[PDB]
């Protein structure tokens, strides 16, 4: 269910309009309530990042073809190959011990190059994310009940981006509004890549795929560059050199990857990158009306997790607690450091959690101090208490 | 850069020897198989035969009694030597090499050659 | 081991999609080279082990077969690729050639 606006959270004009302060989570709902007039559910549809530009590809799988070697006897000159011009190809150049015994006329070091057809079998790829556009869908209807006439509950889809936060639509009764409103991320984008590999995507440090022993490609495409971290020559003997790919590197990263969060791609665009967390903060421009707050009892009576807390990835901490018999109430949550004192150490991310109707779960999103605290949801003897260890 | 290049006497008459050298440049003759191959003016490319450092040969069947390959590592070069010439042996001749790799297990086949010498 | 190949001559234009067979009197596996020559000049090598190309053959050039029967396939026919096309066995000695595809213009 959508929540109710408080008293405070809107302002009303002698003259002009009136405004609405509101912080939008995912997969909840904020409701502007006025007197004989249908309630405005605003919500938070999705955040996204459409088609990041591509910075590197990086290769885990490599394959060899086309081996080519060639020799020359000491003090016959440099041995040469032309494939040494291309840049799809590895080569090295040394010098092997020749003599009588292998076609040359005086022992000694003589010139040996091999070259290599470098293909990359599977690589990653890893996407650069454009700030200034990362998108928001902002949904806006009036709440659909008994059919009114001449109430247009039409549902109305803002689409946004972090340069275009200004954006307008209109009801009934409630007239034109105009939506100003902001991106706050849950991971910082500037420090990350997105890291596709097969099937798969996740959210990973710069720093840790840059530092990456592996060959890798430009974002403008070309030649893969450092090839020998999977590309082996071994010494040479007499005229020929052993050159060999190195094994697949698919586990290491696949390994790496786990202490890594994910991040959804579209099921119908199957371009968009979806994001799971964030807030997206609200200026609702309304013109003058009256609205109608709604305040909030405190959870009093007994709650329980419907999921027990655990880690996100980035953090923070989510649970999901459920208001058998309190009503619609706000739970209140705190991090402390024992359950005697509980002086708040935390940071609460979720904003305002409430349940609406009875038998009701809520998500709770925390930040909780680094080594050991105690989660407590509600108050009183009937208070949940969850212990914790963040490092 | 590997390169042939083949040469000597251009006019031989019949009943003769025929002496033609191949010379390779770019790299040594340790490795692969140096081999001759001809083609009569009009007609197609025929296989004539090689020889290996090791002194390992073959030559084609219908050539193997008047022809001789014999290799010189010492300047790299390799010579061709036929035997009882004819006017079914006026040719083209081409000397190329067998690209070997035993190690890696690569073959290209005749990968390398000369321009070819006409002989009448 | 005697080779033969299909057509003796192919008359095509710029554009046209071209296919040339070769076979063997037995199995030589995938040890089958493909030569372009040009009147006057040397053969040159294209395709090696019935379908890898020679550096560097343009893409539009492709080899297939193994054992009896192979194909050289050029998608789109060039100025250059107009040409005499031998192939050429080299499983077992004595190595054996193609009599021949000329591949001439329309």
């Known amino acids: 269910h959508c929540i109710g606006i408080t008293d405070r959270d809107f302002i009303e004009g002698v003259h002009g309009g009136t405004w609405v302060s509101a912080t939008l989570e995912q997969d909840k709902c904020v409701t502007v309530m006025a007197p004989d007039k249908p309630s405005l559910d605003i919500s938070l549809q999705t955040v996204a990042i459409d088609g990041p530009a591509e910075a590197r590809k990086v290769c885990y799988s490599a394959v060899l073809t086309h081996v080519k070697i060639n020799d020359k006897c000491p003090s016959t000159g440099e041995a040469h190959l032309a494939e040494e011009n291309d840049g799809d190809n590895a080569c090295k150049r040394t010098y092997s011990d020749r003599g009588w015994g292998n076609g040359c006329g005086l022992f000694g070091k003589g010139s040996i190059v091999a070259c290599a057809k470098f293909t990359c079998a599977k690589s990653m790829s890893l996407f650069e994310v454009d700030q200034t556009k990362i998108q928001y869908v902002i949904r806006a209807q009036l709440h659909v009940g008994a059919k009114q006439e001449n109430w247009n509950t039409d549902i109305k889809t803002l689409k946004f981006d972090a340069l275009s936060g200004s954006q307008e639509a209109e009801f009934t009764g409630y007239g034109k509004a105009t939506l100003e409103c902001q991106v706050q991320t849950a991971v910082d984008f500037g420090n990350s890549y997105i890291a596709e590999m097969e099937k798969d995507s996740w959210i990973v440090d710069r720093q840790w795929a840059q530092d990456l022993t592996l060959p890798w490609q430009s974002g403008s495409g070309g030649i893969w560059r450092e090839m020998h971290h999977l590309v082996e020559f071994e010494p040479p003997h007499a005229a020929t050199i052993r050159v060999l790919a190195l094994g697949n590197q698919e586990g290491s990263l696949k390994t790496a990857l786990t202490g890594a969060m994910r991040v959804t791609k579209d099921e119908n665009d199957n371009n968009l990158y979806k994001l799971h967390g964030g807030h997206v903060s609200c200026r609702v421009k309304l013109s003058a009306l009256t609205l109608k707050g709604t305040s909030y009892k405190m959870c009093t009576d007994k709650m329980s997790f419907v999921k027990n807390p655990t880690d996100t990835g980035h953090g923070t901490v989510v649970m999901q607690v459920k208001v058998p018999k309190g009503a619609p109430c706000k739970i209140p949550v705190i991090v402390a450091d024992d359950l005697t004192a509980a002086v708040n150490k935390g940071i609460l991310v979720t904003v305002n959690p409430i349940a609406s109707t009875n038998d009701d779960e809520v998500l709770i999103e925390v930040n909780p101090p680094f080594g050991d605290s105690y989660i407590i949801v509600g108050t009183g003897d009937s208070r949940l208490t969850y212990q914790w260890h963040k490092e | 850069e590997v390169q042939l290049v083949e040469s000597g006497p251009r006019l031989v008459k019949p009943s003769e020897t025929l002496s033609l050298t191949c010379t390779v440049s770019?790299?040594?003759?340790?490795?692969?198989?140096w081999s001759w191959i001809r083609q009569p003016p009009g007609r197609g490319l025929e296989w004539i035969g090689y020889?290996?450092?090791?002194?390992?040969?073959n030559y084609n069947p219908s050539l193997k009694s008047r022809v001789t390959i014999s290799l010189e590592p010492s300047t790299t070069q390799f010579s061709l030597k036929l035997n009882s010439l004819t006017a079914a042996d006026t040719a083209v001749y081409y000397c190329?090499?067998?690209?070997?790799?035993?190690?890696?297990?690569?073959?290209?086949?005749?990968?390398?050659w000369g321009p070819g010498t006409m002989v009448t | 081991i005697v080779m033969t190949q299909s057509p003796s001559t192919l008359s095509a234009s710029v554009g046209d999609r071209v296919t040339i067979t070769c076979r063997a009197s037995?199995?030589?596996?995938?040890?089958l080279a493909w030569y372009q020559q040009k009147p006057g000049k040397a053969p040159k090598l294209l395709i090696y082990?019935?379908?890898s190309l020679e550096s560097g053959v343009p893409s539009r050039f492709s080899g297939s077969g193994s054992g009896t029967e192979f194909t050289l396939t050029i998608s789109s026919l060039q100025p250059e690729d107009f040409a005499t096309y031998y192939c050429?066995?080299?499983?077992?000695?004595?190595?054996?050639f193609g009599p021949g595809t000329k591949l001439e213009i329309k």
């Open positions: 770019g790299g040594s003759t340790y490795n692969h198989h």
């Open positions: 082990k019935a379908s």
């Open positions: 190329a090499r067998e690209y070997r790799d035993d190690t890696n297990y690569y073959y290209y086949s005749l990968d390398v």
């Open positions: 050429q066995q080299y499983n077992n000695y004595s190595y054996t």
């Open positions: 037995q199995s030589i596996g995938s040890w």
């Open positions: 020889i290996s450092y090791s002194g390992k040969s």
